[PDB]
Amino acid sequence: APQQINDIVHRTITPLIEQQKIPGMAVAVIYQGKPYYFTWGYADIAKKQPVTQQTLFELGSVSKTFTGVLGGDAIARGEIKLSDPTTKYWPELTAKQWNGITLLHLATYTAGGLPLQVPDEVKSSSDLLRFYQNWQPAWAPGTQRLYANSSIGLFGALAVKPSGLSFEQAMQTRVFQPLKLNHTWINVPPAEEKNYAWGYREGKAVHVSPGALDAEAYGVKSTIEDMARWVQSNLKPLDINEKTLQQGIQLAQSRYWQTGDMYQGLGWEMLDWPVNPDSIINGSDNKIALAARPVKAITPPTPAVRASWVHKTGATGGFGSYVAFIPEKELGIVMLANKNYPNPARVDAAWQILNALQ
């Protein structure tokens, strides 16, 4: 590898691993459009299995970027519109608070206070209907952003209804397969179990538990190679031959709402480049990222801006991930770890690396 990349990656990641006690880690840097890979430590401590370029990590909420793009693809196919009422695709949602809540609101956490988590007691489909029917908004639609699995998760499930495909089938056929993400899974197959890292929480080996709308909100697993390819695909979507998938990528990086210095896309979040590192680092802390904040509508949405810092944090009980890229520079990074360690540490490391390479 170029020594500049080797040196800034190792100078940044070595102390991070030490400070955070991360058992295993994979990093991809995309520099001038090409990937460079780095791995450390253990996928499975007990079985002494090292992290490799083939190791699967739980992406947690980085999964929302796949959901957002799959939704964008469905819009491009003419199957849904973001201006459609939620009830167009779920007619049984008859409670009056749903009047005026559109797919846009669900996709962008602006429906009026849908909760961060779907309650664990929601198992069946009828449980899910009851939950949404009984939910009471704190705010009018399109006025406050509150990051929520129950919001974008419902968007993903509704976005695929006109296709007749399951969410998983739609994601496989329409996103994973055309992009050759052949080691990226909503459900890890038996053939791939040998590569599935354990997560570590309080020293115990853990994997994500089943939950309602899990695939849509936090349920993808992938390797550092496929995640580097996901970044490449979102860095330069014009190179994508499938017209609707190209368009869906563009739609997911369009700017729909602004709060502070950040813009909400579909799954992706964006800031103008050059960014203030304090903004992305401090902003990534859950004290801000999960807080209820007023939003300004961007009417109409701004098309995807090439000079952007485009990014997403995500975690599960045992994993912590981050992806960031700057389309204008063909520059990006993926950081996958099998410990959930604080967001600002991820973003600080990513900025030190990308800032040095810019």
Ligand SMILES: CC1(C)[C@@]2(C(=O)O)CC[C@]1(C)C(=O)O2
């Ligand atoms: C969004 C979260 C905080 C997390 C994340 O940090 O991505 C971890 C639990 C959670 C509700 C979820 O589903 O993912």
